[PDB]
Symmetry: C2
Subunit: 293 residues, 2 copies
Amino acid sequence: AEEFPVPNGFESAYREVDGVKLHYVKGGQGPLVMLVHGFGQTWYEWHQLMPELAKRFTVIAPDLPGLGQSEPPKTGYSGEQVAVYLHKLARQFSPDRPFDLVAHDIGIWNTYPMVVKNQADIARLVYMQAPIPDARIYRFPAFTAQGESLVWHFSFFAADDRLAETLIAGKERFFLEHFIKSHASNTEVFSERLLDLYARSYAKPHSLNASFEYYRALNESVRQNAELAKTRLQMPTMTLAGGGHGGMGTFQLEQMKAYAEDVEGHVLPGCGHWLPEECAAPMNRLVIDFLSR
Amino acid sequence: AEEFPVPNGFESAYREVDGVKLHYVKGGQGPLVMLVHGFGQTWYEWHQLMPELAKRFTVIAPDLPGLGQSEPPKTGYSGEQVAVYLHKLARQFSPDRPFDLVAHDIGIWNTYPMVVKNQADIARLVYMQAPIPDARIYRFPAFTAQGESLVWHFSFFAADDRLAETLIAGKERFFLEHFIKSHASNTEVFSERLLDLYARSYAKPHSLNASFEYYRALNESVRQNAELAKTRLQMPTMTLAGGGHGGMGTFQLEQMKAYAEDVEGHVLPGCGHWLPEECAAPMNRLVIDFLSR
Ligand SMILES: *[C@@H](CO)CCCCCC
Ligand SMILES: *[C@@H](CO)CCCCCC
């Protein structure tokens, strides 16, 4: 079965990687581009970008381990462990050529280690709307003069005794609508129909638990990246961030400059966290232009 | 009936203040000391200190509006609004003499405006384990290298859509036990019987909602206090804080130095947030000595 509608001309398929069955959607022809979603969503967040990219590229959009239709990881949920799965998957389809990478939210966490460790395999890189795990995340405020902060969910999802799963189970549709809309500027794009689709996917018990395990490994990922970041990224990079409610603002580019030699950044006004949905036309344009250079 | 056992020589009673029926427990003879509890708790957190204070003082311990057995406020939940109820309650019993005040956690938020605006009515002040609402609270971290932070609950409780009430309902005992123990050093002082009593009290639907309305009014309290704090406190003040896991550490006294001219502070090693329960005997001694000078 398919949790989300596959775009015309794409195929939904599975690939076993180190004992873990990963789900992905694939289409197009040409050089490979891999698009990696973040928390609360699946490959489907890319569904409007994929048909345009597939006119010039082979496009693959996997579900992160444990999320969507992908099995949970067998090693662990830290960035370095999950990146092995995604690197091996990409290299199944591009064993002889570098590929491009686009990543959003915790897709950044789950790709940065494989990018920095296999720089010859990455031709171009686009990161949007999340910090790379490092000590900077310990400086975000718990509470702001406007109200709730952007990243208090880090502590909620990381808390022990399965606090988040115990409270959210049975209320997944309510919680996801609140979480998505509270991080959005253009809230109107999140129709009840679309919210139903995303909520049914992450309400699967192992997907709800997998969602929070990424955050429970966040401190480990910070410790891993403290070693890995001793080597800067050499390939062309682009960051995107929302400028509106829920957006990372100038932080996205300012952090990336410590990681990358060659980086350009954009802040999209009137857009929050969910750039592919809130600001599809300018985001799609920026990504397609950058990868087509 | 009574939500909590009343100590011998004390009475459980009610007074109407500005149309709001407030519950309190009262005992002893002599000058008045009012004890103001915080989140997750009721007057009962003072039940070990009260019989000792009652040997030299009249002791009153109210339930905050909307919590325990007290009615919700009819004005609002900001500190300046709640402080009116507590000030008028204390003046019913000590109209002709200044009274002492001891407050814990959000009891601080709900008493500081009354103290700074009615300094002649306050003889001595003890504050423990929470910031006065001001801009300093915007510097607390959302997440730490050890896991969840101390005050991410500020954003969780202040979120709209009744987020906290909706996620916690049906799981009130579970959530309160996790909250108490995650801010404690000494968890064994919380028997199943005591947790059951506190969980049953704040699980009342209007008390569960009242608990979080104090946080939804927190930024309004910060703005109110920005004007109030132009007047420094002049009465003898003491701060107490835990030095262990869950404790405020040195922050409590360092903040109070900006508000008060005559302040002494203590940090209790081995103690977390719940000083009257985790560290009853030394906390009791320090309060009694300070008030008895
Ligand atoms: C995905 C990472 O947790 C959600 C990030 C929230 C956006 C904050 C700017
Ligand atoms: C009462 C105020 O929200 C609980 C505060 C605990 C913060 C210090 C650990």
